[PDB]
Amino acid sequence: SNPTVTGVIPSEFISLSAGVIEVPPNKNITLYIYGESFENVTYLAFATSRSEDSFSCENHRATIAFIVQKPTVYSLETSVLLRQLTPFESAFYICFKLAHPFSHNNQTVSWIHATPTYPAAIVTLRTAS
Amino acid sequence: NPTVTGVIPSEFISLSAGVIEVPPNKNITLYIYGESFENVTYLAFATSRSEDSFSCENHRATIAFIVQKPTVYSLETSVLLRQLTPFESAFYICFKLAHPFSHNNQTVSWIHATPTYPAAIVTLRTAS
Numbered sequence: 541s542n543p544t545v546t547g548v549i550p551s552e553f554i555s556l557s558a559g560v561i562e563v564p565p566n567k568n569i570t571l572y573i574y575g576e577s578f579e580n581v582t583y584l585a586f587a588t589s590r591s592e593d594s595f596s597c598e599n600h601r602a603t604i605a606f607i608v609q610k611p612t613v614y615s616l617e618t619s620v621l622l623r624q625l626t627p628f629e630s631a632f633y634i635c636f637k638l639a640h641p642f643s644h645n646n647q648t649v650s651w652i653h654a655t656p657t658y659p660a661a662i663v664t665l666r667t668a669s
Numbered sequence: 670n671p672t673v674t675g676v677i678p679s680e681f682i683s684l685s686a687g688v689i690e691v692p693p694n695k696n697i698t699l700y701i702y703g704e705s706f707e708n709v710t711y712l713a714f715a716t717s718r719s720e721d722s723f724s725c726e727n728h729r730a731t732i733a734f735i736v737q738k739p740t741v742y743s744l745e746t747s748v749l750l751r752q753l754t755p756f757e758s759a760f761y762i763c764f765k766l767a768h769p770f771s772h773n774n775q776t777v778s779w780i781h782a783t784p785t786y787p788a789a790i791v792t793l794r795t796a797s
């Protein structure tokens with residue numbers, strides 16, 4: 541019932557280190573996101589800081605929303621443009637907007653952190669700082 | 670017949686022209702997404718593929734890796750890939766099907782996986 545991400549395949553990437561994919565900043569790239577329970581997913585955005593104790597991305601969202609295509613029930617395709625991280629930002633963490641809000645601490649939340657299908661999944665991006 | 674849409678290695682080094690480089694001689698886990706995976710029992714790789722390829726029976730260049738089926742659209746498998754030879758270009762996915770079939774009067778249970786769409790990222794390689 542919550543989206544789960546197995547892997548992220550960027551159309552362009554520079555390197556891989558510690559489960560984070562470096563991609564070109566300020567360039568249109570296409571992300572291929574594979575996973576499960578993507579049905580209620582309408583938009584993708586990124587947070588620049590993720591606590592492991594994160595479910596609601598509502599305040600941590602640091603990017604505009606990118607529309608996602610759904611070629612399949614196991615796949616998402618989306619076009620993103622990522623801005624050089626700031627010195628205070630560590631990485632880009634995937635967030636999903638759900639087509640139906642839900643209740644957290646009596647505030648409605650539509651943005652959620654993507655949860656990895658397996659703990660070691662590569663589901664984090666970064667750009668040059 | 671099975672179709673592979675995407676391949677997610679748990680560890681990889683680079684991407685270029687629809688081929689994902691992975692660490693040689695290391696245990697890595699592959700999540701293979703695609704369709705018509707019902708009769709698929711095992712995973713192997715070929716080192717040479719003609720577009721007019723259907724039977725991988727003679728092209729298999731690796732031992733078979735057993736596949737789990739977390740979903741009807743996915744295969745989960747742990748593989749260890751050997752550094753390619755100078756004569757080999759890449760690792761092309763092959764599938765073992767339950768129930769053999771006959772092609773050129775030869776019994777064949779291994780078939781080349783075909784990409785769902787032509788631009789799919791569905792090929793692996795290791796350092797030569």
Ligand SMILES: *[C@@H]1O[C@H](CO)[C@@H](O[C@@H]2O[C@H](CO)[C@@H](O)[C@H](O)[C@H]2NC(C)=O)[C@H](O)[C@H]1NC(C)=O
Pocket residue numbers: 541542577578579580640
């Ligand atoms: C998409 O959103 C709908 C809306 O809630 C989800 O449908 C609910 O599913 C639960 C359990 O399957 C049922 O008990 C509810 O009655 C359903 N409600 C409606 C209005 O259909 C659906 O599960 C969501 N999709 C995913 C993949 O989680």
Ligand SMILES: *[C@@H]1O[C@H](CO)[C@@H](O)[C@H](O)[C@H]1NC(C)=O
Pocket residue numbers: 696747748749
């Ligand atoms: C590779 O994975 C298989 C399956 O888990 C395991 O039996 C084998 O020992 C692994 N190889 C190494 C070098 O760990």
Ligand SMILES: *[C@@H]1O[C@H](CO)[C@@H](O)[C@H](O)[C@H]1NC(C)=O
Pocket residue numbers: 670705706707708768
């Ligand atoms: C699995 O094998 C059975 C028996 O031949 C067949 O009916 C079925 O279509 C096969 N599955 C696929 C996806 O071809």
